[PDB]
Structures are given as structure tokens and as C-alpha cells.
Design a protein around this nucleic acid. Sequence first.
RNA 1: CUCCACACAAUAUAGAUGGAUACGAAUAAGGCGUCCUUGUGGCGUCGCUGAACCAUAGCAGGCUAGCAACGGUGCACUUGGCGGAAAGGCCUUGGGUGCUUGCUGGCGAAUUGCAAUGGCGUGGGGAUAAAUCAUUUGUAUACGACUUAGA
RNA 2: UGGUUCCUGCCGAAGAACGUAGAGUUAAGGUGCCGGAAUACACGCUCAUCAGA
RNA 3: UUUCACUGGGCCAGCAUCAGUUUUGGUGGCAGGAUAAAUCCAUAGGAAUGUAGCUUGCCUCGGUAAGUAUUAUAGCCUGUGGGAAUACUGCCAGCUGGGACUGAGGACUGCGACGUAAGUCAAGGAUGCUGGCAUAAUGGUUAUAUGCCGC
Lengths: 114, 88, 184, 171, 106, 128
Amino acid sequence: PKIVKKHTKKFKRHHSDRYHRVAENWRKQKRGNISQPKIGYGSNKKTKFLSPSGHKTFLVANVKDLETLTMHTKTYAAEIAHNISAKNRVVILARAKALGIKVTNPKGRLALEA
Amino acid sequence: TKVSVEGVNVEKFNVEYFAKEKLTKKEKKEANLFPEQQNKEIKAERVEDQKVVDKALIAEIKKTPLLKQYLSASFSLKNGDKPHMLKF
Amino acid sequence: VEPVVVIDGKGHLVGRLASVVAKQLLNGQKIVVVRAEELNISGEFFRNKLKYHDFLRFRAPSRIFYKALRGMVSHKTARGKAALERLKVFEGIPPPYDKKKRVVVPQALRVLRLKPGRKYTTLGKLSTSVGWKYEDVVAKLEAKRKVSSAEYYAKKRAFTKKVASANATAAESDVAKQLAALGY
Amino acid sequence: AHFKEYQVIGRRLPTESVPEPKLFRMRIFASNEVIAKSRYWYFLQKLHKVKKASGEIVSINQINEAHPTKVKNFGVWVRYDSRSGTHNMYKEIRDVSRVAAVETLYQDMAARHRARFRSIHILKVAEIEKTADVKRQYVKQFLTKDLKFPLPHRVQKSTKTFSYKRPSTFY
Amino acid sequence: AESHRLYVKGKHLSYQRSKRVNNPNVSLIKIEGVATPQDAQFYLGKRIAYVYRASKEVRGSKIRVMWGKVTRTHGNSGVVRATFRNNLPAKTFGASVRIFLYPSNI
Amino acid sequence: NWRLVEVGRVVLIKKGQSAGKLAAIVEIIDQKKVLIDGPKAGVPRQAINLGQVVLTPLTFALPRGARTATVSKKWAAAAVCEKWAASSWAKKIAQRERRAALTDFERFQVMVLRKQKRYTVKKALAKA
RNA sequence: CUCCACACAAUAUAGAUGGAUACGAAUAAGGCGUCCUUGUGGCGUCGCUGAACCAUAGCAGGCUAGCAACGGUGCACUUGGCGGAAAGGCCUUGGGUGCUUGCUGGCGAAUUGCAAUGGCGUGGGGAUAAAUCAUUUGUAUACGACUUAGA
RNA sequence: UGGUUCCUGCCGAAGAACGUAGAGUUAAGGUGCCGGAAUACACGCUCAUCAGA
RNA sequence: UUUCACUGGGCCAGCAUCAGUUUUGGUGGCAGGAUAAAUCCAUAGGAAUGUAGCUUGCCUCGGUAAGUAUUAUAGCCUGUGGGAAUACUGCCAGCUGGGACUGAGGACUGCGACGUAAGUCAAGGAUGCUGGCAUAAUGGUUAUAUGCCGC
């Protein structure tokens, strides 16, 4: 469907630029030119957790995790975890293209030689 | 400004007549990776249709004064041309 | 509709013309305002003299009208500065603008806005009364300009009289009647 | 807004053993019927001790002009309140119709006397039929034989931005 | 021969605004030779292009175009509201913007 | 030479339901308002403010407070319809109406005939 | 001002895509034309908007054919005059050489497939009129500065 | 006395009650220019040698 | 494996037909009023900001004036009678046009309507057609600029 986002930017603390010690996470203060988080900005329940590709992401550590997305190919998309070694990433890619599952992050820690 | 369409037997060609053509054999493997550019020409049947319509249309035009030269000249908007006021 | 609009200042009001021009510069129309010394002010000379006085606690009429105009535009913005950069203001009509037509702004005309039987004020007399020592220089150039312009207009009227004669002898022709048929 | 004449009749209610009271009739100039009825009660209480609950309206009516083509002349009695004190005033009006004269009269009274539509209480509008009963000089100014004068305000709305003509009140 | 204009040029006046808050989404257009809203009814829904010239040559030309359309009238003077695909950079106030005749009713 | 507001001054209502119809001042109301009737043009007898109307330099004799049947009689006997049509100003008004009435092939014929007339005039020019 | 090296250029920046298209004054008055008694004369006209006027066909404007006129018009010249308020433009002579839609012809356009805009800087050398520093003077001078004079 | 460490939702005292947007219509307030929007219209009054808004 | 034929995803557009909200037009038929009033026509009186006529006086061979003179060589007003029309106000489950925003939902069920019938449909929320796109389409990031707001 047509994904509505309701808020493109981020929600930052008041005076977060004014000091380097102050973080940028949302912390409630305890003018109105600051966008404050609230439940009205909560996205549509169908559209929630959707990539710009239109899938829901799913972290995959190994091939047995990849096989759990066998039936739900058009709905989900596999994302390789950040700490997977490069021997296993090519096996995961070959298995996923065999399964026909869209990998969100191919070409991670990998190159194509000859 | 109006002309009579009645001299022309327009009905023959249809929406399907203007369907843009397709290729086969995956363009015959791009002639084995060598491109060729002879396909630019127009089919003669289109030209013949244009001539057949054009004769009976010019025969209508030549009865009216200055209409050939009107169709030959293009159109633009001059200074002060106000199309909401400009009755057409 | 015109790239550069040339506006005469004779017989006009200060603020209404300033409002019109200030609107058009923010609209992007390039404007030169000429014969600025002949701008007219509502009220008597003396009131307006006191107004320039208590303001003063630049003497040229162009500076005066520029002041009035600059007050209406938000001058501190970059957009207002570009709008002011579109503007030119001149007392008299220097070249090249002497050879071009000067439009008027009817909603800022003195003779239309003022009720008859009211005192007004000439801006050049005001500037000379407050220390702009150039008004006699102006009228001297303007007299020569009016001489040459009367020469130009006398030539122009004779040539257009010849054009009128040629259009008169062009009449009764069938192409003229076909223009009449089309309305011209 | 633009007013209207109204024949308004009130009859304050026939009580037990009092049948058919006297059907008091007035003529109200009002933009609608509703404020006409309100003004009718506002006069009827000033006539005598009625209330809108005490009586009722018989018939609300609009009445047109019989001859709205002829320019008639009018003598009008007005009473109103310069807030503390009241006083009457007699004005003479040259007008085609009655209700336009009453319109112009309200405009003039609000101009010269700062009086509202509620403060003004119309006593009488009647046509002055023959000439020289026009007591006022300014209406009599237009009673002359063969009257001619030029237009004032030759200034018109130019409707355009710039003029090439250097225009002139050429009249 | 001398002219090739199939549009009406008109000034990008401003954004829709109060005294303190301006809306960049709706833009305000002055169409030349239009003083009445009834004349502006002719210009409703019409396709608008802002033409400008860039330094770089994006696709065979250095000239780029924003598009959009007239939505509704604005005020008494025939000033016309407009909505574009991307909003205007607002340094284009008083700029000449092209208003095309398609979608033509006539 | 002045026009004057007066009885028998034929006028032209530039703004209103008429928006240009020949009428005549039958009677004056004041400096602001008058009584007019335009029964030949079709605008009825009515009171009007003078701003909505313009005076024409044409006039004729019209009785004071004359009724509409008498008005149309004196109108036709004045024959100022023809005197109006003979005026170059009404010719210009009809011309600017006809220019709005133009068609694009008509306007193209205007272009062509302007070319041909200009050719003939420039031959007539530069010989005299 | 001039010889090598390389970066755009044959463009545009507040907004090009028919033309900024020139009397002056008066307004309870003007203008134009005309006549005479040249006037504060008479007559007629006009305004009441530029909604005007001028330009405007041709591949974003092709290639040719004649008919007619001695027109129009571009460009480069050429002749002379006018323009100083910031003239930087205007007007003219004379040819040249284009186009000419004033008229009539004859071939080309497509498929872009139904809208998607579609000389100037650097870097390194060469040449030059002066200026400065230095010397010197004292009408000057806290110092600058001033100021002589010197191939 | 001063300080007292994450978020969101719900409940919550001693002209207009405001989730997030889109579109429309309006209250008040305005509509010479800044400044968006009639230098609208109509009728009267005021020329002030620092009216008045 | 080979021949031949057909077809292709996603996004962004434009158009058509719809639906929902809205805005702006054009146009028709009604119903009420004092059954509009008026106007127009018919009649009778009246008067003047008295038309024709007459008298008189100054005076450019005839202009004026001030009497007469109530229609004559203008007319007006009022009264009464006849006939509509239109204004205003309201209604239409009258017709028709333009523009904007929206496309939620997701086999069928329901209310309908048109249809003799079978079927269809604007009827329990949008579908159809076409275009562009891999040296993509397009989208994002920053720094600057613009405008508005911000102690």
C-alpha cells in the first residue's frame, strides 16, 4: 500500500545544539516551534514496519534462519546481521537467491573478483 | 472553423493500427552483439493512407478561401493576447 | 507588460505613488521615476516643511521620495534590497529616458485625488527651501528639452499627418472594405 | 439594509368579557418582517402599556409604491434622542419612492446626529403635493424652471495600473 | 515566426500567509491581464511551469522546469492560488512563471 | 462647451444591468441621483446615481416628468439612435465589441489583409 | 603591452523569448483639423482608456519556380547632420548584397509513436612608461606627511 | 537550603479546551505598502502653524 | 535441448468513467404578493416650474417680457376601468458545466435501481487505458542562499 510516514524528521531535545554534553535522544522537558513526540504521529498499522521496497525486514544469522522466510517471500526481506563472517555471507546469498528472497543488504563485507 | 470530413473514408484504420511494433528472438541476439539501424524508415502503407486521406481533404480545403495558408501557418500568443477574452 | 516602466512625477502624490511603485518593485517590475521635482504633497507647504524639519532632527527630491518608498518596503531583507536595486529615481528627465514615453499612475494623480480648493506642495520648492541648491539647473535643462521635444512632436505630427493622408487615399479599396468586414 | 414598508396591525388580545379590541395599525420601515414586528411592539409599548406577551400582531404586510415612477416631495416628522434630551425634527426630501427617502433619511440622521436605527422614531412621512410648501431651501433649489448644472466629481475609477494618456477631467 | 509563446507569463507573487505564518505549499500567482476572479475561472486547473536555468547541464540542457497547477482563486483582484509538485524557493518572488493552456476546456 | 445634466440629455449607463444602453434623464432628484428611462434600449425607468452612468453630447427636447409612451415618442422623433450610431465613439464601442467577436481564422485574415494593405500603402508612401 | 602551460568558453547572474511605442501645459479645460479679423476669434472634431498602435505565415521557420513593383526590409559599408543632464544614441546620402508572405506554384517534414523544459580565467617567461624607496632641500615636520633638486 | 538520572499512553485535583494530516467553511481581527486580502461602493462631516486614525 | 507464439515487476505521471467532500458557473419550470406594485391602453377632472393661441410693452424688419390662455401647434398629474409582464421571496426528488482534494476497504452475501426476460448498474469506499524508467527512474545526505518564525 501507500506508506504514510507522518513525520520525516527526527525528534530532538530542546537546546540540544546549544551544548555538546546534551544528547539528541528524546527526553521530556519537565514556544511550540519544537516538534514533540506523541501518539498522533504513530504510523498506520498496515504500513508500519515497511521498507521503501515494501517489505518487512527480518534479521538472519544463518541458513536455518533464512529458511524460516521460505513461505513469506513477498512480505518479508532478509537482512544479514552485522557480525556475520564473509564465508557465511556468500552462502547466505546463494541460498537466498535460490529461495528468491530479497536480501536488504547484499555486498556487505564482500567484493566480486573476476 | 469547420470542414467536411465526409469526403474521406476514415473508418478503416483503428486504434490497433497505431500499435507500435515489437521484436522477436530477443532482437535476434542483437545480431550477435552488433547493432543495426535500418529500422528507422516508415512503412509505406502509412504513407499511402496519408495520401488517400490527403487528396479528399485538400479537395475540401480548396473550396474554402485562405484555409490552406491558415493550416500552414502556426500559432502563438502575442502581447496583450488574453485567452479568457479571446473567443475561439 | 513592459520591461522598464518610465513614470513621470509631475502632478502626483508622494505616498500613493510610493505605495504603487513599492508594490511593483516587489512584483519585479523595473521602474525609473523621472521629473521627481514636480511631485506634490497634500496639505500646505508649511506643514510639510515642519514634517521634514522634525524628521531631520539628504536634500534632493529623489532622496525624499526614496525615503518615503524605502519606508514602505521591508528594506532590511535581501528581497527588499533587490527591489530597491530595481529602482531608479531622477529629478528631471535625463537621457536616455527623454526619448521614451512616460506613464502616469491615475490613483496617485493630484488632480483626481485632491478635492479642488485644497493646498498642495511642490517638492522642488520644498527641497530648495531646505537646502537643495540645484532647482534652477533643473528647469534650465528642462526648457531645452521642451524645445527639442516640441521640435520632435512638430515633426512627428506632420509625418503622421502624411500617414493619415496615405491611409485616407488607401481607403475605399476592397481590401479596406474587407478589413471593415473584419472590423479594421 | 434596504428597508420596506409594512402595514402592521395589533389588537391587544380579546379577553374574557372584552371582545374585539381596537386593532391598532401602524406603518413600519424595516429591512425584514421580524425587526418590523419588534419595532411595532417598541412603538406600541410607547403608545400605552402593552407587552408583546400582552397582545398580538394582526397582520404583517408589505405595501409597495403606487407610482414609483414619479419624483415626489416629502415632509417628514422624526423624533429621536440626543441621548439625554429628545426633540422633534422636520425634514423635506425629494425622492421617487417613500422607502428610499426613509433610507436616505436614516443615512443623514446617522451622519449628522450619530443616532442609531433604534434611537430614531419615525413620526410621519407624507408627500408634499404642490410646490412652495417646500419650506426647505435646498429642495427648493431643485424646484426651479429648466434646471441645468454640470457634473461634479469627473474623477472615475480608472481600473488599470499605468496610464499612457495623462488623463484629464475633460468635462 | 517572431513569437512562439503558447503560455501566459505571470508573476510568482508570494506564499499564502497570515501576518506571522506563511504556507510554502500554496503559492500566489498574478496572471497578466486578469483583474476579476471570473476571468480566473478560465485559468482553473491549468498546468503551470516555472522555467529556470541552472549552471550544470542535467540532461542535454541547462534549463530546468518545476511543474504544478492552479487550484483556486485568491481575493478580489484575480490573484490565483497554485500548488506545485515541489514548493518554490521563495527567492523567486516576482519571477515570471509560465502558465499553459492545457488542460484546455476549449 | 460642457454637457449638462438636464431633461432630454440622452445618457449611457456604463455600469449595471444596462452596462451600456442609451437612456434619457426624465427628471433630476438631486446632485447625486436622477430619474432616467431607456425604453428603446430596453432599460426601464428607474432612479440612478450619476456615477453609474455617463452623459452623451447628444440631447433633445423632452417634457418634464414625461411618461414612458411620451418618452418613446420623443425618442423616436429625436431620431438620436441614428445620431448615436453616426458618432465615432459608438463606432469605437461597436468596434471593440467586434474585436472580441473575432475568430482565429478571421484574425489570420486580418493579419493577411494588414500585410497586403501595408504593401499598398508603402507603395503609396515613398512616392509622394 | 608580448612567448609557453590548462580551465571553462561561442551563457548568465531577483528572472530575456513580439516591440520601453517620447510634446507641453491646463483640468470650473484641453487637443486636433480648418477658416479668417491671428484672437481669450469662429467652425467642426475627439476623449468617456493601450480592449490602442506597430510588427506578426514559411523546418524554432526548409529547397526551388515564376507574376507584379521600383516597394519594403536585414547586414556590412559609405555620405553628411543632430545628440553632453549620465551625450554612447538618432537621422541621412549612395551603392552593394540577402529575404520578401503583394500573388501564384512545385518538392521536404512523420517514428520525438497521446503532455512531461525538451572570447574568459589561471600558472611560468619577455617587453614598457611611470611611480616608490634611497640621496638632497626647508616655506614644512613628534613621526609620517609636505616640499625642492638630481642621467 | 540546594539537588534528586529512560519513553509513551490513560486518569488527573486543590476569538477559541488544542492526537496526526488533507480539503472546505468561518469567529475575532483586518483588506494603501510592509502584509495575505476592495486605492470597493454609497452618503454626510473635518484641512488641524505638529487634526485625526 | 530446440522451434514458434504470447506475456511480464515496481514507481511516477497524464487521460477516461466513477464515488465522497467542496467550490464556481450557465440554464429551466413552478408557487405567493394589492393573485406583485408599475408600465401600456380607456375615461373624467385638475393644476403648473402653463404647451399652443391671443393681448400689450421695449425692441436687430422679431425677439423678448407679463398677463391671458388648462392642450391647442408640448404635455404632466390625479381619479376610475381593462389586460398582462417583471421584480422580490420561496420550492423543484429541474437540466447542464468547470476546478480542487480524496481512493479508506478488499471472494460472495445487503439495500436497491434498470430490465418482459436473461442480465446490467454510477447500488455495502477506484477502476480502466497510455507514457517514462538501468551509463536508470528516482530518492537521500550535507553546505550555502531565500522567505517566515524564534530573547
